[PDB]
C-alpha cells in the first residue's frame, strides 16, 4: 500500500497505479512541502484472529498461542523484467532502446508480533506540511506542531501500527525501545539508480524465539503481521515523474500452544465495578 488506493478498480482512471505511487512533485521553495498522501508509501499491516484457548483459573495459569517461526518471501521479482512500456528510454537523445526498469532507493521491512508494531517518528525537515486527513503524522498524535527534535529523536513521537496504509514509512520507523512481543527485520538501500536485488527460496526459515526460548505470545488472540517492500522508482516519459513500486510479501507463520501465567487478577473485575 504505497500511494494509490485499491478502490478505483478500472484500468482507465489513470492506468491503474495500484501497486505504485501516484507521482512525486518536488517542493516549490524551501518552506513549501505538501506531499499529497497518494504519493507517500505507507506501512502494510494485517491481524489474524486466532481462536480462544484453555484457561485453568483454579490455579493461576493460562494457555495462549506462540509464533514459533516464520517463512517470508517477497513475491514478484521477475515482473521487473518488463522492459517494454512507456517509461523513460535508455537512449533519450533518440528516445530508443529499453524502457528503463525499476531502480532506486529500496526499503524492505517485515515484522511478526503478538501486538501491533510500536513506531517512532523521525523525518527530514520538520517544516513539511503533510495533509491532515487520510494519513497519520506526528501532528496527528502529538496534537501540537512538529519541532526540531523530530528531526533526530523525540521520545514523545511514538505510535502503534493499528491502521493500515495510513502510517507513511518516511515518518514512522519501528521502535527499538518498545517492541518486546514483536520480531522485526529490515534493511534500507539508498541511491538514485541502485539496482534492486532480491532472493527467494522455498527452503530457509526464520526463527522467532528469543534468548529465553519464547517467541511472540499472541496477546488478545491476534497475530499481527506488518511489512513494507519498496523496490525503487519508475521514471515516466513526458517529465521525470517517479512513481514508487512495491511488491507483496508472503508470510507463513508456525505457531504452537504454550502454558503461561495469567497476569491479571480477574477478580479485579469487581474493581471495574467499583
Amino acid at each position, epitope marked *: 500500500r504505497m500511494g494509490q488506493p485499491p478502490t478505483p478498480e478500472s484500468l482507465t482512471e*489513470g492506468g491503474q497505479y495500484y501497486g505504485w505511487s501516484r507521482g512525486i512533485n518536488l517542493a516549490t521553495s524551501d518552506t513549501e512541502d505538501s506531499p499529497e498522501n*497518494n504519493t507517500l508509501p505507507t506501512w502494510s499491516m494485517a491481524k489474524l484472529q486466532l481462536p480462544m484457548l484453555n484457561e485453568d483459573l483454579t490455579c493461576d495459569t493460562l494457555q495462549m498461542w506462540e509464533a514459533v517461526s516464520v517463512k517470508t518471501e517477497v513475491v514478484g521479482s521477475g515482473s521487473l523484467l518488463d522492459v517494454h512500456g512507456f517509461n523513460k528510454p535508455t537512449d533519450t537523445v533518440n528516445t530508443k532502446g529499453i524502457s528503463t526498469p525499476v531502480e532506486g532507493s529500496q526499503y524492505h521491512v517485515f515484522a511478526v508480533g503478538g501486538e501491533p508494531l510500536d513506531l517512532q517518528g523521525l523525518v527530514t525537515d520538520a517544516r513539511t506540511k503533510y495533509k491532515e486527513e487520510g494519513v497519520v503524522t506526528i501532528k496527528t498524535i502529538t496534537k501540537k506542531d512538529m519541532v526540531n527534535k523530530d528531526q533526530v529523536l523525540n521520545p514523545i513521537s511514538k505510535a502503534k501500527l493499528d491502521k493500515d496504509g495510513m502510517y507513511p514509512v518516511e515518518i514512522w520507523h519501528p521502535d527499538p525501545a518498545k517492541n518486546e512481543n514483536t520480531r522485526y527485520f529490515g534493511n534500507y538501500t539508498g541511491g538514485t539508480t541502485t539496482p534492486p536485488v532480491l532472493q527467494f527460496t522455498n527452503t530457509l526459515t526464520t526463527v522467532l524465539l528469543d534468548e529465553n526460548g519464547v517467541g511472540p505470545l499472541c496477546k488478545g488472540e491476534g497475530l499481527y503481521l506488518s511489512c513494507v517492500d519498496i523496490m525503487g522508482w519508475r521514471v515516466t516519459r*513526458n517529465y521525470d*515523474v517517479h512513481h514508487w513500486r512495491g511488491l507483496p510479501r508472503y508470510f507463513k507463520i508456525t505457531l504452537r500452544k504454550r502454558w503461561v501465567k495469567n497476569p491479571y487478577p480477574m477478580a479485579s473485575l469487581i474493581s471495574s465495578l467499583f
Partner: antibody
Amino acid sequence: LKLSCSASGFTFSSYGMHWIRQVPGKGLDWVAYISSASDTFYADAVKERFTISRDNAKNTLYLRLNSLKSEDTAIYYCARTRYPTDHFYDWFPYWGQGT
Amino acid sequence: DIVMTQSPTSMSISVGDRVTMNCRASQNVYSNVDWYQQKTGQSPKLVIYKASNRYTGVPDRFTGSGSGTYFTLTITNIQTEDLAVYYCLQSNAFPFTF
C-alpha cells in the same frame, strides 16, 4: 452555481484540468486546478467558496460556485493540460469555449 | 502568491515592426512561464509554452526567452493576425497567476 465542462476526444481521467475566469476588461485570472489523481488546488481569493471536482466515467468537470456568488462574475473557461502526467505544472494549451 | 508585472501596458506599432514585452515575477520561477494570445471574442490561445518553445502552428516570428525572474516575448515582423492581447502566466507553484 454548479458549472460543467464536457470533454471528448481523449482519455479524460489522465489529464489535469484548470478553471480560469476572465473579467472582460481586467484580463485573465486563474481560479482552480484538479489533477489526474484528484487533488484540488484553488486560488487565494476563492479558497473556501468554490469546489472544483471531476467525475470520471462521465468526462465532466464541476466547479461548484461560491454558493453565494457575491462579487465573482466573468467568462469561465476550462483548460486541459498538454500531457497525461501527474506533474502539476503542465502549461495547459487546450482552453474551453467560455461561459 | 507570485505577482507578474508586465512593462508594456499598451504599445502602438505597425506591421513589419518589432515588439518585446517583458514579465517580472516576485519570487523565482525557474522556466515555467507561458505566453498566451487572446483575440477579442476567442478563448486564449497558447503561444509560447515553458518560456522557450513555440507551440505547434505558431509562426517563427514569435520568440520566448529568459529564465528566472525576467522573461520576454518578441515578435520580429508583426502580422495582421497578431493584433491581440498577450499575457504571461507562471505555472511553477500554486496558485497560478497571469
